[PDB]
Amino acid sequence: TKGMVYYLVPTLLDEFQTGSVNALSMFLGQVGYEMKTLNADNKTDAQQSQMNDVIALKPAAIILAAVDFNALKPSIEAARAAGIPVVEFDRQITSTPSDFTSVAGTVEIGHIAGDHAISLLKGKNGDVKGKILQVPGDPGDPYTLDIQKGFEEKIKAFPGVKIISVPAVQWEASAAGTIVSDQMLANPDIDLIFLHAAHLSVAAVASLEAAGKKPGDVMLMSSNGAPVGLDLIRKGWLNVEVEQPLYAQAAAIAMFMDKVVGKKPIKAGDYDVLGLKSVVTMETWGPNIKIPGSAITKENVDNPSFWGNLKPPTAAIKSVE
Template sequence: MLRRAFFRCVASVGALAMVGLGSAGAQEPPRLRPKEHYTVGFSQPGSASPWRRAQLDSIRAEAIKRGDQLIYTDAGGSADKQVADVNALIAQGVDLIFLAPRDEKLLIPAVMAAKSAGIPVILLDRTVNPSLAQAGRDYVTFIGSDFVEQGRRTAEALTKATNGNARIVQLEGLPGSSPANGRRKGFEDFIQAHRDMTLVASQPADFERAKGQQVTEALLRVHPDASAIFAHNDEMAIGAMTALEAVGRTPGKDVIVVSVDGTRTALQAIIDGKLLATVETNPRFGPVAFATMARYARGEPIEPWVVITDRFFDKTNAAQFLDSAY
């Protein structure tokens, strides 16, 4: 435990130092030379969830379609390993790195190492702390959803469904990740404007189904009068619904549940009346990621944030999109 904390501290200090060097040196990301085919690195924080697997499938399919070579790394849930993974991609001399950072701060050294090596980085689905690294200077761009808006939309749906009166348990995603930070902010900012929407407990469950169930079980013992649950992703929501059923409470009736991601399992739960709504986080990044890379290689200006448009699923449209969900 102490050893891990020490290395995280070292990584943070190193990140700050490298940001300073980057600011004093190159004021833009490394360029990408136009050529017919590229060797591209893709670093994911893990691949255990359906969302991560769908994203990987999309990236792989687009690489094959374009004739590019893809080198994939899976950090297995470790920020330290992901930094090492990026360093390994740098050592292999890839042309560009797609990076889905596990943590907003701890992956700064990886971003800066790639920049120093002359390899451009495009962030996918998660971003990094903007006070430490910036799009258009240290990396090319961030491609992803508006996490704050996702949180706001779930809060709005929950407020409407409960007539503005609920005792809410929040299951947070991975601490330090941009989706967890943004979704929490958007949700909490919205409910603060509604006096009877009370957040009684908020605890991380790391975007994992099993942890979502475990945390919900523990929180229900402390807050048996909870009437609503906001989960930062569908996997935790499914775990929460399992926990509710285990104590004889009916999801969708006794406790209203909302979440984020838009998985097939979540859409089926909406159809079954267990889940009120989920805000989509589209995992199919392949086409937009490689198209953005191609634009950058042509020398086109790239916006600092390539926004992914997300749909909203509830009982009015869940059946319509079930077959196309991942």
């Protein structure tokens, strides 16, 4: 064994989070690290306390996905000062250095979602008009902040589309259900609802159903690729799911961990991570790998490369030498 790695996961409340524990644990194990997971259960002060605890344990590395991206900056600094490598998973922290960061191309995921919304709202006469209800996730999470930026950039170019945006605080599907019910009663002309993770869409479907809607009446889209999302595609409720590449983000951390722990430089460039072109840059917050997401529709929903089909790579993750 090469040592222990602590993963500070923000919650265990959807398939991405629990999937990330499983993938990081398995992949790191393939490259000779034992992973231990601590769950913040959506409490910032818990995760901050967990950081102190783990710093005291002096592990080979810490993997953090911050509950709140502004709140954790001091903890990151403390860990690194104690000589412990810190890796950011999924939730990008740009305001202080980390030793590695592994994220989806989130602005690009918002762009893809934007392109599909536009396509979905384009009318017979070539114009783009309608009303979109957008349901971001928690404001403390750069994943949704950056998807929102990309999405809005696309949609704003077509001012005949009105957009209503209401975040689901703490990523709660229950909030999303309330939002969809209240907003649809006030705006019967909502044509499309874009939610930033598929577990939110599950609540949206129930809210639509309770208002008498059937699959396809209101177009629906979400943006993380979770299994419940792909199942809503198959059932006709969801028009599009723009996945983030969970397995690849996890695999990349395992692939580069020897370099992180060895304090060896991580060279900028294009890498293959589980078949995806993954881009490493040197940023002010340290080495960063950005891995692309993809749009999933009924036409390609069964592609085993998409993590919501729960067919992880068969072959050995290997350390980057």
